[PDB]
Design a protein around this ligand. Structure first.
Ligand SMILES: CC/C=C\C[C@@H]1O[C@H]1C/C=C\CCCCCCCC(=O)O
Lengths: 180, 180, 180
């Protein structure tokens, strides 16, 4: 059966992330400005917190390949590969669409630790692109998640933020050996 | 229980794809022509059609890493990470080898929608280098595929082409909300 | 249940690997010398041998994204996407962390051939930085591994190396059509 795991991802502007590599080389007529296009590449790594926003869990880490830009939607389609690191709990890997202007479903490609052997899909919800994202992992194939990862979930909105104690990585507010 | 899904991938030269990034940095001694080498990178995105070639399904999107060039076999090994998008049906993600001179088998790393929880392997058969390819997904772990994705397959050959109405994306010749 | 597969990965310095692409753009204050940082990219391909070190099996191939550098730990975190090629046996794909100064667990994202439908996690253990690594794949979902892949394992240690006959790719010391 499916177990839902909720995760907040936030760019707290303190990891030098993301790195936008304009390799698509496309230029705007008249201005010669860069235009986002197939082949721009974007390494990145943000922080992740649990659904209650009270616990720092770890980080995301990976690489987005820009596929297309939409003027009508004011944003971009990327093809993404990245992992979520939850300290000693392990990691989950994902692959699939990252769309700046709408929600999408990524493949859960596997994991480690308590997530070893996991599979299924994960919903990516843009709360406020690019600083705040919210994931619902529909996890299959693994034992019952620990209660610490299943606290009542804060509903996402642009104003939500990690608890002070989680932002500060204090005792009682971090995953065991949370990923730095 | 394996279900076979046949897909045609066609580069219709309309997407600025592929983008060849010559980061391997190698040149041919005596001519200075580019030599394909480890570390050349190739973002890409092509169109996909169903096995009967009557329906536009969506796109591929991803990234190839060039691994080696064989002068003997007149081609290259790539390591490929990409997804297949089928509009509302969802997506399939793959990882593994693309060899420009022979068939290969890719890992199916998962999916979304009707493909959520999928696994197995997919045969990559090149029809024309590198503009036309034919895939056989040996899908495991999912519910019976919709009949619309299982129409009688056009046998692969160099001259095969999508139906005009599919190429033109006419309303009864496209997957539901087909991926653009 | 789980089947253990032991693999040695060796950079024998004959494949022009790795290719370090300094796209993170970070430089020392005065020297302008390279500082490893988020967004450096590293395409790579090494040789792989069986656990007994008597058989050349094939190669690894893929791409690492540098995520962070640690001065305190004197090393880097990468996010890795790569496959292991075992000649005619097939391939295994992996996704997850490579940390230059400690062991980690990768997701097994799938495979082909005898590895078709595989899942689970793989332990990455560094033998000697940067040239030798030792993997334990905890493979689920596949048929009993062939005896040739399950020979008594050489205990990992800094001094271990392939048998000369395996290094030279001689008869009796290669996988069927071992990947070159
Ligand atoms: C992984 C195969 C799936 C689809 C085919 C990918 O579009 C092909 C890109 C992968 C390798 C490139 C093969 C050589 C073509 C490069 C032409 C250079 C250019 O004009 O951009």
């Amino acid at each position: 059966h499916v177990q839902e795991l909720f995760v907040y991802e936030i760019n707290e502007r303190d990891r030098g992330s993301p790195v936008f590599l304009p390799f698509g080389g496309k230029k705007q007529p008249g201005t010669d400005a860069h235009v986002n296009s197939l082949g721009d590449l974007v390494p990145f790594s943000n922080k992740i917190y649990d659904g209650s926003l009270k616990t720092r869990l770890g980080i995301t880490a990976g690489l987005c390949t820009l596929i297309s830009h939409s003027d009508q939607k004011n944003g971009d389609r990327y093809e993404a590969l990245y992992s979520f690191y939850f300290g000693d709990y392990g990691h989950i890997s994902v692959q699939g669409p990252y769309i700046t202007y709408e929600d999408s479903y990524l493949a859960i490609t596997g994991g480690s630790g308590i997530f070893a052997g996991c599979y299924g899909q994960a919903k990516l919800h843009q709360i406020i692109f690019p600083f705040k994202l919210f994931y619902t992992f529909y996890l299959q194939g693994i034992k019952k998640l620990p209660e610490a990862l299943c606290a009542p979930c804060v509903p996402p909105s642009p104003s939500v933020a990690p608890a002070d104690e989680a932002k500060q990585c204090l005792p009682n507010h971090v995953a065991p050996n949370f990923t730095k």
